[PDB]
């Protein structure tokens, strides 16, 4: 029953400047810890550097709000 | 192990305009649901009506962010 935690991850991610939706989220329990992988949408006209910064901001925001997450990998794809 | 959920309640409550800290929070599981009772601080110079509105706003904010809560009673006390 991972809906509640995944809902929290998505909402946290979406509240970060530059996030155009969560394209993909795979979360799994490793013991009582969550390890996750996420792909966010970003403006196709952002620079690669900006997209990297937005990914780092999502990582901080999400990990800050969901204490059980012990690994979170965030990548980005162009989204209009 | 109610720390994580109680931390979430407190943080949610504090982010509501007019909340001057959480003075008291008693939360308990009833099955897999949380029932809670909270006292917030408010400006002593707010009206009784305003304090009521702030309590209602905390109730909405908290219940909106913590899905397992099925009852939340919020009251207010003067805090400088």
Swiss-Prot record, chains A, B:
Q: Which residues bind Fe cation 2?
A: 52
Q: Which residues are noted in the entry as Fe cation 3-binding?
A: 77
Task: Give induction info.
Answer: Part of the probable 17 gene mamAB operon.
Disulphide bridges in this chain? none
| Binding residue positions for Fe cation 1 | 37, 73
**What does a knockout show?**
Single gene disruption has no growth defects, no accumulation of magnetite, forms empty intracellular magnetosome vesicles, decreased levels of MamB, mislocation of MamC in 1-3 foci or rarely in a shortened chain. Magnetosome vesicles are fewer and smaller, aligned in a chain with the filament, only a few have very small crystals. Other, possibly precursor magnetosome vesicles are visible. MamI mislocalized to cell inner membrane or in 1 to a few patches.
The protein's location, in the record's own words, is: Magnetosome membrane; Cell inner membrane
Give the consequence of mutating residue 73 to A. Answer: Wild-type magnetic response, no change in magnetite crystal size, number or shape
Positions of region (C-terminal domain (CTD))? 3-80
> What interactions and quaternary structure are annotated?
Forms homodimers via its C-terminal domain (CTD) in the presence of metal cations. Interacts with MamB via their CTD. Isolated CTD forms homodimers.
Identify its protein family: Belongs to the cation diffusion facilitator (CDF) transporter (TC 2.A.4) family.
Biological function: Essential for magnetosome formation; required for stable accumulation of MamB. May nucleate iron crystal formation. Probably binds and transports iron. Binds divalent cations, possibly up to 3 Zn(2+) per dimer in vitro, probably iron in vivo. One of 7 genes (mamLQBIEMO) able to induce magnetosome membrane biogenesis; coexpression of mamLQRBIEMO in a deletion of the 17 gene mamAB operon restores magnetosome vesicle formation but not magnetite biosynthesis.
Question: What is noted besides the main data?
Answer: This bacteria makes up to 60 cubo-octahedral magnetosomes of about 45 nm in diameter which contain membrane-bound crystals of magnetite (Fe(3)O(4)).
The domain comment in this protein's record states:
The C-terminal domain (CTD) is probably responsible for hetero- and homodimerization; it assumes a V-shaped, dimeric metallo-chaperone-like fold that can open and close. Val-48 forms the hinge between the dimers. Binds up to 3 divalent metal cations (probably iron in vivo); upon binding there is a conformational shift to a tighter dimer. If the CTD cannot fold correctly the function of the whole protein is decreased, suggesting the CTD confers functionality on the transmembrane domain (TMD), perhaps activated by ligand binding to the CTD.
What is the protein's given name?
Answer: Magnetosome protein MamM
Q: Which organism is it from?
A: Magnetospirillum gryphiswaldense (strain DSM 6361 / JCM 21280 / NBRC 15271 / MSR-1)
Identify the segment of the full-length protein shown: 215 to 292 of 318
């Amino acid at each position: 029953h991972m809906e509640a935690v995944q809902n929290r991850i998505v909402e946290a991610a979406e509240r970060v400047p530059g996030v155009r939706g969560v394209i993909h989220l795979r979360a799994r329990y490793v013991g009582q810890d969550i390890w996750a992988n996420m792909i966010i949408g970003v403006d196709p006209e952002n620079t690669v550097e900006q997209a990297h910064e937005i990914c780092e901001a999502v990582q901080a925001a999400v990990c800050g709000k969901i204490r059980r997450i012990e690994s979170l990998h965030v990548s980005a794809e162009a989204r209009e």
